[PDB]
Each structure stands twice: as structure tokens, then as C-alpha cells.
Design an enzyme around this catalytic site. Structure first.
Site, PDB file in Angstrom:
ATOM      1  N   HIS A  56       4.879 -21.726  -6.797  1.00 21.08           N
ATOM      2  CA  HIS A  56       5.937 -21.721  -7.824  1.00 21.08           C
ATOM      3  C   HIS A  56       7.171 -22.478  -7.331  1.00 21.08           C
ATOM      4  CE1 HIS A  56       3.357 -18.297  -9.336  1.00 21.08           C
ATOM      5  NE2 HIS A  56       3.505 -18.990 -10.445  1.00 21.08           N
ATOM      6  N   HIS A  91       5.404 -27.846  -9.051  1.00 20.05           N
ATOM      7  CA  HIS A  91       4.862 -27.144 -10.235  1.00 20.05           C
ATOM      8  C   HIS A  91       5.782 -27.364 -11.453  1.00 20.05           C
ATOM      9  CE1 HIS A  91       3.262 -23.990 -12.761  1.00 20.05           C
ATOM     10  NE2 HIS A  91       4.422 -23.357 -12.761  1.00 20.05           N
ATOM     11  N   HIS A 137      11.425 -23.437 -15.928  1.00 19.39           N
ATOM     12  CA  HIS A 137      10.748 -22.185 -16.266  1.00 19.39           C
ATOM     13  C   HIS A 137      10.428 -21.208 -15.102  1.00 19.39           C
ATOM     14  CE1 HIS A 137       6.887 -23.752 -14.916  1.00 19.39           C
ATOM     15  NE2 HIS A 137       6.420 -22.527 -15.070  1.00 19.39           N
ATOM     16  N   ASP A 138      10.309 -21.702 -13.861  1.00 21.09           N
ATOM     17  CA  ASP A 138      10.120 -20.846 -12.674  1.00 21.09           C
ATOM     18  C   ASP A 138      11.293 -20.919 -11.665  1.00 21.09           C
ATOM     19  OD1 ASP A 138       7.667 -19.424 -12.983  1.00 21.09           O
ATOM     20  OD2 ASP A 138       6.513 -21.205 -12.536  1.00 21.09           O
ATOM     21  N   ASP A 180       2.201 -24.487 -18.367  1.00 24.99           N
ATOM     22  CA  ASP A 180       2.270 -23.645 -17.128  1.00 24.99           C
ATOM     23  C   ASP A 180       0.919 -23.618 -16.409  1.00 24.99           C
ATOM     24  OD1 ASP A 180       3.267 -20.201 -16.395  1.00 24.99           O
ATOM     25  OD2 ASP A 180       3.526 -22.111 -15.362  1.00 24.99           O
ATOM     26  N   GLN A 238     -11.802 -17.128 -10.512  1.00 21.43           N
ATOM     27  CA  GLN A 238     -11.312 -18.256 -11.281  1.00 21.43           C
ATOM     28  C   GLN A 238     -12.174 -18.346 -12.535  1.00 21.43           C
ATOM     29  OE1 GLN A 238      -8.491 -20.843 -10.799  1.00 21.43           O
ATOM     30  NE2 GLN A 238      -7.968 -18.751 -10.155  1.00 21.43           N
TER      31      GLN A 238
HETATM   32  N1  LIG Z   1      -1.468 -19.681 -12.861  1.00 21.20           N
HETATM   33  C1  LIG Z   1      -2.736 -19.532 -12.453  1.00 21.20           C
HETATM   34  C2  LIG Z   1      -3.192 -18.294 -12.006  1.00 21.20           C
HETATM   35  C3  LIG Z   1      -4.540 -18.210 -11.610  1.00 21.20           C
HETATM   36 CL1  LIG Z   1      -5.169 -16.716 -11.017  1.00 21.20          CL
HETATM   37  N2  LIG Z   1      -5.362 -19.286 -11.651  1.00 21.20           N
HETATM   38  C4  LIG Z   1      -4.890 -20.466 -12.102  1.00 21.20           C
HETATM   39  N3  LIG Z   1      -5.700 -21.519 -12.150  1.00 21.20           N
HETATM   40  N4  LIG Z   1      -3.597 -20.586 -12.499  1.00 21.20           N
HETATM   41 NI    NI Z   2       4.990 -21.632 -13.950  1.00 19.44          NI
HETATM   42 NI    NI Z   3       6.420 -18.112 -14.143  1.00 21.73          NI
END
Ligand SMILES: Nc1cc(Cl)nc(N)n1
Ligand code: NI
Ligand code: NI
EC number: 3.1.4.17
Length: 330
Positions: A80, A84, A118-119, A229, A281
Site C-alpha cells: 500500500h 500502488h 486513496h491509500d 484498486d 488467490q
Molecule cells: N488487494 C488484493 C488482495 C488480495 Cl488477497 N489479492 C489481490 N490480488 N489483491
Molecule cells: Ni488500494
Molecule cells: Ni485501501
């Protein structure tokens, strides 16, 4: 402690930045991966705002101060993070370019800024964590804890001297854009995604969805925020696989913290449960990303390449599970 501000050196540099020509065509595509162009990330964001909203949408100086201060308010966490944020903003740009007239000039400016912010100040901890161990943030923000925090951080940055890119807006438009941004950041709480998607699916299937209906618009925007996101799942497999290592690195560090406080983490956050990741996943794609991109494609047909990419990546995780993975570098 406090909100961080970029140096004069930082923002003046971004002002002088120019994007190599070959990238102009690349940036337009959904599958574009910012990964190999780290120095250029703030500049790619300028470029996208200038292309989507026009070079006069923001006074450049304030835009440049805003972006580099935004960068400095992301932490050095494995996922994060600043990378990202720009990845998410790029996905929004591709969605908006492909659906440009469906969205107002106010919605486009608001949304690219919301994605980039956003994060903000994410600490590498989930809402689950903060609520479990009653961090002060969980007391301030009973639901969507970190998201309410990210919006608060966004407003703080705007309120920095020379950072308010929305100042030139009418008093009414200003309130509308902050509201646009608040709703968009809040929608990146996956807790809300399940109900939102279910509603939208219902509205689409019965034919009641109407994009001139504000409540409908807010929900469509919400799902767009989800799609952006989670866009790591819409990239080329090696790119997707690499980002997943970062996602899990951050989770496992959270799990490590939980173990010290006498709680066994969920398997997903358990670094001694790595063998379960491919199946996790698979579950995440089945319960979250697949239905998200499916519904988004029904509503906004030109977004269909996000969905095809995500289906391809699903299949790649299924290959991993069957034992058919070939060589991977990370
Ligand atoms: N944001 C996320 C969370 C998880 Cl567990 N897996 C993915 N690909 N993206
Ligand atoms: Ni995010
Ligand atoms: Ni977030």
C-alpha cells in the site's frame, strides 16, 4: 506525526519533467504496467491529468506541489505504497478515457485525485487489525477505518499552503468534488464492495440502472474504484505474480504482529501457510475480482479488457494449483 510536505526541489523537478514519446501510446492501454518506469511515475500522473482534464484544469505549480506531497505521505510498506497509488490512478485514466463523456469534468478531476490519494498514510495494517486491537483510528472511525483516514489525509494535503488544486472551483463545485472524492475513497473498503456489486448487478439485470440517477452514479463510481484498486489482477501474469508477492509480504508482517498478541492469524496472513496462497488467490478471484470486472463490463462495455485479463490470471492461478507453474523470478 503530522502531514509531510515536498521540497521546492521535488515539485520544480516534476514541473520540468517531460514524458518520453514512446510511452504516450502505452499509457492509454489497460494492461500498461508502470513497473519499469519508477522515476517517471509523478510525471505519468501529470500527463494523465493533462490528457483527461486539460492542461488548464489545475494551476501547474499547485498540481506539482500536490503530487509530490502526496508521494511523501505514502509509507515504505511492501504494497500500500506510492507505486500502488499511481497504478490505481492509471487504471482510472484508462477507464475514463474509454468512457469519457459519461463523466463530468468534475467527476474526472475528482476521481484521478481520489485514486492517487486513496491509500494515503497506509501503515501496512488492515481494518481487521485496527478494530481487533482497538487502535485509536478504530475509535475515531468505527467502520471503513483506514479509508476514512485516507480521506482525512487527502483534505490535509489540500489545505497545505499552495496545494489546493480545487481553489478555482465555484463554491458549489468545490463541495461536489470533495463529496465525489470522499465517496470514491470510502468505496475502496472491500467490505462495501460485496453489497454494492450485488445492488448494481440487480439494477443492471432488471434494467432499472440509470446513470442520470445520483444514487446509481455513486454506485457505478464505487465499483470503478474497486476495479482500479484491484487492477494488479488485470495485468500480464508475471506482473500480476510479482505484485502478489508484495501483497502477501505485507499480510504476513501483519500476521507476525497478531501472533505476539496471542491471536493466530487467518491463513492468508500466516507466513508459515504459504502453500495455501494459490488456493487463496483462487478464492479471492472467485469471490471478488471476477464478479467485480464482470459487472463493470456489463455497465461499461469498453472496460471488457480488464475482465479478460483477470480471467487469464485466474487460469494462471489454477495452473499453479495443478502443479503446472513454469519458472518464476521475483
Ligand atoms: N488487494 C488484493 C488482495 C488480495 Cl488477497 N489479492 C489481490 N490480488 N489483491
Ligand atoms: Ni488500494
Ligand atoms: Ni485501501
Amino acid at each position: 506525526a503530522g502531514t509531510s510536505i515536498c521540497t521546492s526541489e521535488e515539485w520544480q523537478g516534476l514541473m520540468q519533467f517531460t514524458l518520453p514519446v514512446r510511452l504516450c501510446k502505452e499509457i492509454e492501454l489497460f494492461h500498461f504496467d508502470i513497473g519499469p518506469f519508477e522515476n517517471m511515475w509523478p510525471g505519468i500522473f501529470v500527463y494523465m491529468v493533462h490528457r483527461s482534464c486539460g492542461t488548464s484544469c489545475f494551476e501547474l505549480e499547485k498540481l506539482c506541489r500536490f503530487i509530490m506531497s502526496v508521494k511523501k505521505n505514502y509509507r515504505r510498506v511492501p504494497y500500500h505504497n506510492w507505486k500502488h497509488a499511481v497504478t490505481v490512478a492509471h487504471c482510472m485514466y484508462a477507464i475514463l478515457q474509454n468512457n469519457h463523456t459519461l463523466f463530468t469534468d468534475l467527476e474526472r478531476k475528482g476521481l484521478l485525485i481520489a485514486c492517487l490519494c486513496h491509500d494515503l498514510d497506509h501503515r501496512g495494517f488492515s481494518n481487521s487489525y485496527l478494530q481487533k486491537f482497538d487502535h485509536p483510528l478504530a475509535a475515531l472511525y468505527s467502520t471503513s477505518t483506514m479509508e476514512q483516514h485516507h480521506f482525512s489525509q487527502t483534505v490535509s494535503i489540500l489545505q497545505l499552503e499552495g496545494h489546493n488544486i480545487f481553489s478555482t472551483l465555484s463554491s458549489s463545485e468545490y463541495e461536489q468534488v470533495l463529496e465525489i472524492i470522499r465517496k470514491a475513497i470510502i468505496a475502496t473498503d472491500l467490505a462495501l464492495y460485496f453489497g454494492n456489486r450485488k445492488q448494481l448487478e440487480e439494477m443492471y439485470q432488471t434494467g432499472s440502472l440509470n446513470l442520470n440517477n445520483q444514487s446509481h452514479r455513486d454506485r457505478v463510481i464505487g465499483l470503478m474504484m474497486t476495479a482500479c484498486d484491484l487492477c494488479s489482477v488485470t495485468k500480464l501474469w508475471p506482473v500480476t505474480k510479482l505484485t502478489a508477492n508484495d501483497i502477501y509480504a505485507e499480510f504476513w508482517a501483519e500476521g507476525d504482529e497478531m501472533k505476539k498478541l496471542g491471536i493466530q492469524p487467518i491463513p492468508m496472513m500466516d507466513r508459515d501457510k504459504k502453500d495455501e496462497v494459490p488456493q487463496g488467490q483462487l478464492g479471492f478471484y472467485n469471490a471478488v475480482a471476477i464478479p467485480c470486472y464482470t459487472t463493470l463490463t456489463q455497465i461499461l462495455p469498453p472496460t471488457e479488457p480488464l475482465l479478460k485479463a483477470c480471467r487469464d490470471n485466474l487460469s494462471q492461478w489454477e495452473k499453479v494449483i495443478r502443479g503446472e507453474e513454469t519458472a518464476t523470478w521475483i
